[PDB]
Structures are given as C-alpha cells and as structure tokens.
Amino acid sequence: PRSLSGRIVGGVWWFFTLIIISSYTANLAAFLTVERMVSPIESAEDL
Amino acid sequence: TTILESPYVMMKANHAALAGNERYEGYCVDLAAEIAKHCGFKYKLTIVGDGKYGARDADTKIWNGMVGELVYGKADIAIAPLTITLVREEVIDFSKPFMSLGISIMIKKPQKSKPGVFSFLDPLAYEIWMCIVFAYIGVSVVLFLVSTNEFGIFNSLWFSLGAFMQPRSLSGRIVGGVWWFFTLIIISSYTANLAAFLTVERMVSPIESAEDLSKQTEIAYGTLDSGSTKEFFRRSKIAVFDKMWTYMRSAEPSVFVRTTAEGVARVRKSKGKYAYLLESTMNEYIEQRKPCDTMKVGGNLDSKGYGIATPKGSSLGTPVNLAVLKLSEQGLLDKLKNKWWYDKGECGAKDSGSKEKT
Amino acid sequence: PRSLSGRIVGGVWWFFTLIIISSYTANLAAFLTVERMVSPIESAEDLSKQTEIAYGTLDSGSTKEFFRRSKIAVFDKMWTYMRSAEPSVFVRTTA
Amino acid sequence: PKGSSLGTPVNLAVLKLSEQGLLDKLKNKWWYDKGECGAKDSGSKEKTSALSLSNVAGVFYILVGGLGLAMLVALIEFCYK
Amino acid sequence: GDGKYGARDADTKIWNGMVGELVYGKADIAIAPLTITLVREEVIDFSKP
Ligand SMILES: O=c1[nH]c2cc(C(F)(F)F)c(N3CCOCC3)cc2n(CP(=O)(O)O)c1=O
Numbered sequence A: 001p002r003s004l005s006g007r008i009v010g011g012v013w014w015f016f017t018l019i020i021i022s023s024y025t026a027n028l029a030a031f032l033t034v035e036r037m038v039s040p041i042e043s044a045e046d047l
Numbered sequence B: 001t002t003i004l005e006s007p008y009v010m011m012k013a014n015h016a017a018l019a020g021n022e023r024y025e026g027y028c029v030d031l032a033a034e035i036a037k038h039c040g041f042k043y044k045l046t047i048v049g050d051g052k053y054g055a056r057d058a059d060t061k062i063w064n065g066m067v068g069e070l071v072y073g074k075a076d077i078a079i080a081p082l083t084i085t086l087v088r089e090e091v092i093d094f095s096k097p098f099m100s101l102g103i104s105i106m107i108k109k110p111q112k113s114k115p116g117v118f119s120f121l122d123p124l125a126y127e128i129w130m131c132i133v134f135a136y137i138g139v140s141v142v143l144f145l146v147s148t149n150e151f152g153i154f155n156s157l158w159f160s161l162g163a164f165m166q167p168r169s170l171s172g173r174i175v176g177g178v179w180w181f182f183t184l185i186i187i188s189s190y191t192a193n194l195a196a197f198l199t200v201e202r203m204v205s206p207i208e209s210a211e212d213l214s215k216q217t218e219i220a221y222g223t224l225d226s227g228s229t230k231e232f233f234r235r236s237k238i239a240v241f242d243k244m245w246t247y248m249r250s251a252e253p254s255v256f257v258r259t260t261a262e263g264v265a266r267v268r269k270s271k272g273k274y275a276y277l278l279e280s281t282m283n284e285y286i287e288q289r290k291p292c293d294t295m296k297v298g299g300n301l302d303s304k305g306y307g308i309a310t311p312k313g314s315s316l317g318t319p320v321n322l323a324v325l326k327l328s329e330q331g332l333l334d335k336l337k338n339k340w341w342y343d344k345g346e347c348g349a350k351d352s353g354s355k356e357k358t
Numbered sequence C: 001p002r003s004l005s006g007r008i009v010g011g012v013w014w015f016f017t018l019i020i021i022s023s024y025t026a027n028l029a030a031f032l033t034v035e036r037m038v039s040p041i042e043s044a045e046d047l048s049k050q051t052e053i054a055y056g057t058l059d060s061g062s063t064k065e066f067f068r069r070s071k072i073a074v075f076d077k078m079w080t081y082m083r084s085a086e087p088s089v090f091v092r093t094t095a
Numbered sequence D: 001p002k003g004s005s006l007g008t009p010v011n012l013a014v015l016k017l018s019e020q021g022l023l024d025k026l027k028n029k030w031w032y033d034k035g036e037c038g039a040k041d042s043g044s045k046e047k048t049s050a051l052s053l054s055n056v057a058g059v060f061y062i063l064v065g066g067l068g069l070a071m072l073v074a075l076i077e078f079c080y081k
Numbered sequence E: 001g002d003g004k005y006g007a008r009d010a011d012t013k014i015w016n017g018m019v020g021e022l023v024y025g026k027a028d029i030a031i032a033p034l035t036i037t038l039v040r041e042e043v044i045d046f047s048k049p
C-alpha cells in the first residue's frame, strides 16, 4: 500500500524509465529522419 | 534571320524605346554576337516574315520561313533553333549542332497528399503487423498453459484479455514483463518511424521513362496535333514508341492539343492525369516558369540538334562551323543556356524544395 | 473481471488511443524538427545556399560594383542572383 | 579526308539513317538488346518506401526466448511442488 | 595501326590514329566513335553526329 519509503522508489524509478523510453523513441526517430536526409547523387552538383 | 521563340529570341522590355539589334534578347541573340565575333562581321537581326522555321509545301514546292529566306537570297545566315533535318541539309548548309536535344515527357509536379488508409499500414509493415499478432496469440497460449473443456475456454478468453494489452507467479511473470518490453519497442518504433515521413516528406513520381507510359493507362498522354513530334511516333518502328502511337492514334477524347500552351495547360489542370510530349528544350524552359508546377522526367526519346544554317556554298560556311565548335569547347554554349534557362529562370528547383515547408 | 464482451472493448479502445497519442507525438516532432531546421542568416554563404529570403544592394556604389567584379566563389553566385532577380532587389537610397 | 568525294554522300547518309531510326535501333541492339543486364534494371524500376522487419525481428527472438525461459521456470515449479 | 583516335603531337606536329591515316592518305574514311572536335574539323571533314 502506501509505504512512503518504497513508494517514492517506485515513483522515481518510473520517472527514470519514462525519460529513457522517451529518449529511445526520440533518438530512433532521428535515425530514420537522417536516413532519409541522405540524398543519392542525382546530379553533378550533388558531388 | 531568326524566329521569335523564347528564350532564344525575345522582344526586350523597352523594345519600343530601342532600335536595331538592341531590340532583341535571348540565347540566339547572344549566340549571334559570339558567332559574329569569331567570324568577324557586322550583322542586322531580322525576324522572318511568315514566322515559320523551314518546311516545303508539296504542291508549290516552295520553301517557307528562315530556310526559305536563305534559299531565295533574302538572308545571309540563320541563327535560330533550326532543326538539322535531311530535307533541309539538301538545300542549305548546317553547321555542327550548337545544342543537342530530343523528345521529352512533361508531367505535373507530384504534390500528392491523398488520404489512403495505406499510409497507416506503411509505417509498420504488413509483415510486422502479422508477427506481432502471431506472438500476440503466442503469449496468450503460453499464459494459458500456466493456469474441463469449458474451463479451458474461459481461461483462454481470460488470457486473451491479458493479451488485449494494458500474483507473483515467477513463470508467467517474466512473460508479462518481456512481452511488455517487446510491445514497448514496437510502439516506440512505430512512433519514431511515423515521425519520419511527416518530417522530410519527399515526393515520389510514377512515370520514370517512356516505357512507363506504355505499360499503364491510368495516366493519359499525347503530343501536338501537328509537328515532327507527332509524326515521330507515327513513323517510329521502335517497340515502345509503337504501342504509344497506337494508343494516342485512337485515344478518346483527343489526346492531341492545338498549341504548346494548350498542352501545358492540360498537364496543369489534370492533377497529374495527363502527360505532354514535347521538345526537351522548350520543356526545360517551362519547368523554370511560374507557378513551377511542371517537370521533365526521364531521358530524351531521340537524338536531335539545332544548328546555324547557311546558304549552300556560302563564304560564311566553314568559318561559322568552326566558330560553333570553338564556342562549345570554351563552354560558352553551355554557359549561354544556363544563362537563359536556369539563371534567368524563375524556379530554382533545388531552391524551391529548400524553401517549401509544411 | 473477464467479461469478454466489454473486455475487447477496453482492448480495442486502448489500441485506438495508442495510435492517436503516437500520431500526436510523431506529428509534434516534425513541427519541432523543422522549427530547428530553419537556420538564421549567419554568413554570406547562407544567402547563396537559399532563395526564400531575397537580398540586394544599392543600385549604384562600390558595394554593388564589388559583387559584379568579385571572382570569389560565394560572392559570384550572389551577384548572379541579384543581377537577374525580379522584382529589382536593388534600392535607390540607403534609407 | 578534307575535300573528299564521299564527303557529302556520307553526311546525308548519316542524317537519313537517324531519321529512319536506324541509328537508335543499332544502339539498342548492342547496348541493351545484346546486353546482359535487364535484371538489375527491372529492379531499378522501383524500390519502395517504409520500414523493414529486420530490426523488429531481433525483438521477436528475445520475446520467444523469454517465453521459453518461462516455460522452463514453470515446469520446475510444478516439480518441486 | 597505333590504335589511337586522333591527336596531334605538339613537337612533330604529326597526326596519329585514324585522323592521321586520313590526312596522310592511308584510308578513305573513318567509321568509329571519333569525337567531333574543332582541332580535327580543321584538318578533316566530320559528318553530322
Ligand atoms: O527547325 C525547327 N525548330 C523548332 C524549335 C522549337 C523550339 F523548341 F521551341 F525551339 C519548336 N517548338 C517546340 C515547342 O513547341 C513550340 C515550338 C519547334 C521547331 N520546329 C517545328 P516542328 O516541325 O514541330 O519540329 C522546327 O521545324
């Protein structure tokens, strides 16, 4: 129940994992965004 | 002699306040000065009367346009986008090509942003939706083994509810944890991936070559009702171009247009349902004109080329010929084209994509 | 408890809201990603690499004559643009 | 050679061949028709848009592995009892 | 012979390859991927491309 001791532990640990999974999601979005940014050499100006 | 055809020869802005050669401006206007400089001679730019290029009426057997004014001594030289054809090479002299071209394809700029529920099945692949469902029942069955025939049905429906996502039996406990970590990664992947298309959002186009126009029918296409472009497909014995002509020959309504302006308008008002076939030179120029909603796709269908025309057995013959070769090697020809097509253009293609947002 | 009827309702509704909140998050990211993409005009090379923001000089003076005669890479392109930019990117006075 | 007899004739011949599409035909004969690669060109007609299964697959194996680990922990529990 | 196209040695001022065999009467015509250049158009005749 409301065991304040281990209670804040579950809360802080939750806030901890929240940040991590958010970071993973954000970063993973960037790896696909940049993956598209890489434009193939279509013309000479690209070289 | 020359013809009024943008952007080769055009009337300058304040042409009414000017006279002589200063009245005109364009690719050929500059090309004239260059040729005259290397051949050493003064010249007077004049526009052809009938405003035609160079054809031969079958009946009267009379030449018209610039090619005509050359054969009948009206002009000394022709500096314009005059195509080097066999029928003309017989009556006049053509210098080496100062600009190689051909027949190209013009379509509407793919601004495709339709609904299509298929933009939701793309982020997460159909193959992935499947496996996530197989593993879905693959967990509801493993949990089902953790907990007489009906007792198994009520439980299988309970584990299916423990499946439809949201004590300390270590066995099935780590199953719920691992399955949670599994779905966590997937939903994170879906979210991240979905962010990508809506961020970059680069457009794609169906038709890449001429063979693509023949393999499909959804997108209609045609040429000018009269000209070498239309007569090309009609007489062409090439595989691809043959089928294309067969289609256009009996396509209803008429896929042929009266003028080049009508053709472009048809492409801009068909939402990408109509393609227009025309000379690459004029096409490339159109792409650099507002509202910048047209683009050339794929390479040319044939190899042509314009040249400086001079009366058969003329004195300017050899000189001009060499002059053209000299200009091209000095990259002066390429420079001139860039000046009137892209530099003077109103549509920086890579700049219009760098300056467009959503 | 395990009322199969309303059970799948809670599951499907959960999958529904999952997609929406994921869409909101993803979409909100593109608007912030592009918001950063917009780079402020820092150097002169930035004026040549883009076209959205027009630019010009005084119609007469060493400033204008500079770009015209400049054989430097960046300044060259800049002049090419201003030389044929419409409407006129050049002004009469500094004011 | 400069001032040759074959000069004009050959010139016209080239123009005639091109208009008859004979030149384009010849090129197609030796470049594409006689070519050995219409396979890498038929696949270059198109590659498509979105995500792959590869990455997602790695997370599937770790899942089944977890299920198997549990199926193992389950058996032992019933044995001790 | 030499298996060249058509260049001009600055020193000896001699043409080599096919373009050479044309100027020196070794051959009557050259049918090959010979580039139409200004330096060659001066010594020989090039048909349309
Ligand atoms: O020698 C020729 N040179 C030509 C050059 C051009 C241009 F590209 F504009 F420079 C054009 N246009 C293409 C687009 O439609 C408008 C005018 C037609 C030409 N024609 C007529 P054809 O009989 O239809 O080939 C000739 O005869």
Ligand SMILES: O=c1[nH]c2cc(C(F)(F)F)c(N3CCOCC3)cc2n(CP(=O)(O)O)c1=O
Pocket: E005, E006, E033, E034, E035, E036
């Ligand atoms: O008239 C000329 N016609 C040429 C025709 C070709 C080919 F394309 F193979 F037909 C080539 N190659 C291109 C690829 O590398 C191997 C040989 C070189 C030619 N060169 C020499 P350049 O001085 O390098 O231009 C000429 O002079």
